[PDB]
Structures are given as C-alpha cells and as structure tokens.
C-alpha cells in the first residue's frame, strides 16, 4: 500500500542525494513500466503518486500523432470536440485508474528500476558537483587498472575514468597511489563512467604550472603555445608580459627546480620552456631550440615554413622520431620542412637564386 511507499521513501540511505520528488518520479516510472508489462498492448501511463496527500492513480497518455498503430496510444491532432479536449497537441486522458503495484513481477521490476535510477542519479550528482572545477588539478586514488582504462576515487564515492589515450604509453598505475590529473571532459548523460581526467594533454601542463609556478595565475607569464609527446617531450612557449623576468630563470626554476618537478610529475618528460613571440621566425627558432638555425622561409599561400638546419647538428635539430621538429609542427601548426644540410643552406638566398 501507500504506507509501504512512505516507508520506502523515508527508509532510503541517501535521503537528500535522492530527494523525495525524484524518489517518487522513479517510483512513477516503476509503476508505469509495471502497467506496461501488465497489458499485452503498449500504452504509456503516468502515476502521480501524490507524495504526501494521497495514493497513486494511473492514467493513459495518448502521444497525439496522426498515426494509428496501437491506437491505445494514438489519437488525431484534431480530436478536440467531444471528451472536452479543445487541443492541438498533448491531449492525454485519465481513463484507467487504480492498477496493482504490489504483486511479484511489479515489485521485481520496481526494485530493478529503482536500483538503476538511484545509481544513475548518484553518479550524475557526484560528477556534476565536481564539474564546476573543470580544468583544475585534483587529487584522488586510482581504483582499478586495466589494459583499456583505469578507475579513480576522489572521495565520497567519486568515480572517475581515465582512458588509455589520457594515460602515457609508459604511465603506470596501481590501486593505492594518488595519481593526480586535470578534469577535461564531463558527460552527465553517460550510462557509465563520465568523469574524464587526463595527464597527457598540455592543459594538464598548464595546471601543473598553476600549482607550481607562482608567476602563472597572476597573468604575468602567459602560457601561449604547448605541444606534447607523451612521456617523451613537451615544448611550451610562454610569454613574459613584463621585461625584467626571464622564463629561463622563472618558469624553468633554479637550475632545474621547477622543470624537473613537472617532469617527474609527467614521468620524465623533457620540457623545453621557451618564449612566445609575435614573429613566426623567432617562434619557430625557439620551437626547435636548442639548435643553430641559419635559415627561414615562409609561405602564407601554403602555410609552410622551411628551416634549413646546419650541417652536423641534425641530431640536435631532429633527433629521435624527429620530435624536435614534430612538436614544432604541433606548436605553431604549420608544415615545417627540414631537408637540406649543406647545399641550399638558406632556401631563401639560394632557392630564389
């Protein structure tokens, strides 16, 4: 009876994590599913259990369309003269009343859908309460490890998922440690894990500076460009709004005091901290730094940049996997060309000659 409904609404553990209104909404959905499974025909119904004043009373929704299939939930958009509709859409009736909500199959489907709804609501609430802190470094233990994704707990049953793309190729986890990342994606509609925390992205780097570098956070040393190779190398061009501060002595630290800390956080990532400039030439020179660039060729029609490096410093300007160039191509976003070594040493005073 409805006394059982009051007992189950007052006997919930998460009383305010699932308010009485949403309790009764889930219970109405339960009773609607039960009544649907009762009749062989498909007919949508609403319950309106009358949370405090009275009992439930099933109804019959029409879903007004010009179709006729299963006319139990069909009625034309113009049937409005008799039965007192005077409507165009939304015409719903209250024909059937007082269904049964306490038999075996009804109780079973009610329990199932209530479990589903409470777990969904708890997950949605615990993710939304953290969604406001999107783009910040958060602590938290990892829960379970797998070859495709890992689970994390941020406290008070805060489930977070970190996919394989968010993890570095040699990033390592075991349930028990506090792997700290940055929240980047939220999906409050996801049927499963929806709290997305990353560490392989440059925004993570930014937040790292924010928790380590006192310069950033006051907009005195703006982080402009950032490219990453997970666990391999992070090229970050940060600009200095003032003049008496050098990023080599401020963002890098005191002989590798901050860059080393952020590298250990990133699992040994060579971090090249350079200065952002409004000139593409100096920008790409700092991108491939350290090196000895003696050429610059720009093409705005094809958006290409040719940099003829010096003969002998190949491993100093290209290195393994061409990272020193690849991240550069991922720093500014233009096609960078490093081909010549001895002949066509400039590609500007020789190619055009």
């Amino acid at each position: 009876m409805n006394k059982e409904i009051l007992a189950v609404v007052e006997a919930v553990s998460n009383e305010k994590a699932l308010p009485r209104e949403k309790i009764f909404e889930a219970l109405e959905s339960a009773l609607a599913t039960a009544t649907k499974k009762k009749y062989e025909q498909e007919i949508d119904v609403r319950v309106q259990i009358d949370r405090k004043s009275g009992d439930f009373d099933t109804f019959r929704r029409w879903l007004v369309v010009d179709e006729v299939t299963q006319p139990t939930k069909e009625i034309t958009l113009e049937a409005a003269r008799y039965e007192d509709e005077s409507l165009n859409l939304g015409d719903y009736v209250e024909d059937q009343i007082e269904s049964v909500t306490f038999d075996r199959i009804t109780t079973q489907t009610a329990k199932q859908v209530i479990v589903q709804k409470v777990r969904e609501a708890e997950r949605a609430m615990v993710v939304d309460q953290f969604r406001e802190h999107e783009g910040e470094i958060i602590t938290g233990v990892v829960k379970k490890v797998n070859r495709d994704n890992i689970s994390l707990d941020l406290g008070n049953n805060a489930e977070a998922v970190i996919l394989r793309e968010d993890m570095l190729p040699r990033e390592n986890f075991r349930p028990g440690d506090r792997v700290r990342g940055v929240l980047y994606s939220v999906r409050p509609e996801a049927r499963g894990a929806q709290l997305f925390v990353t560490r392989s992205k440059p925004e993570m780097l930014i937040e790292l500076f924010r928790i380590e570098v006192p310069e950033i956070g006051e907009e005195v040393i703006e982080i402009k460009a950032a490219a990453r190779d997970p666990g391999s190398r992070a090229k970050i061009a940060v600009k200095t709004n003032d003049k008496r501060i050098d990023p080599v002595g401020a963002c890098v630290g005191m002989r590798g005091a901050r860059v080393q800390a952020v590298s250990t956080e990133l699992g040994g990532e060579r971090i090249d901290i350079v200065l952002w400039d409004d000139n593409p030439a100096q920008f790409v020179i700092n991108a491939m730094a350290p090196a000895d660039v003696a050429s610059i060729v720009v093409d705005e029609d094809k958006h290409t940049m040719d940099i003829a490096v010096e003969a002998g410093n190949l491993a100093q300007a290209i290195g393994r996997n061409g990272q020193n160039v690849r991240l550069a191509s991922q720093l500014s976003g233009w096609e960078l060309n490093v081909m010549t070594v001895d002949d066509l040493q400039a590609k500007h005073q020789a190619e055009a000659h």
Binding site: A7, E10, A11, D103, Q108, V115, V118
Partner: protein, 100 residues
Amino acid sequence: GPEEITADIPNVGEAALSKLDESGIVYIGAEVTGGDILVGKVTPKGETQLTPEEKLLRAIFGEKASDVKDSSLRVPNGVSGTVIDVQVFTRDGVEKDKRA
C-alpha cells in the same frame, strides 16, 4: 527470531523464484516437475532486531539477507504435476498474509 514466509530467497536466481507470488507462495495452477522452491520459508540464524528500513534496503540495495538459512520447502525430487489448492492457518496474533 521466528520464521518468515516472505519471497526474499538469496543465493538463487529468479528462474527458481518465478513460480512464487508476492506473498511467498506458489501460484494456484503453476506446474512443477523437479525440485523447486514453492514456498519461501526462511529462519534467522544470528542476531534479531533487523530494522525494517534495513530490511527494505536489503530487499532493494546492499547485500543479501543474512539470517535466512534457505530452509524453504521444495517439492521432493521425483514428484511432478500442477498445484491446484493452497491452505494456510495463522495463529491468533500473527499478521495474516495477503494470500490468506
């Protein structure tokens, strides 16, 4: 604690409990051919004072109902047929189930 004829039988699926009603008794006309629990008899083995809130919780959430012992009566292995009638007698004082 006294016994119960509820339908909350843990350590078993729904197929063995599909023939049980909301009260905990096999329906009138439900066939059976092998050993099948046709009445949900459970008995407490440990502590009494299971709060009704936690009872409904266990019925919906949490873990299984511990003090049950799964002492429910099933038909012996070998007898078949369809049940045609069920009687029930409650002593003056015990809550009469809805089937009674």
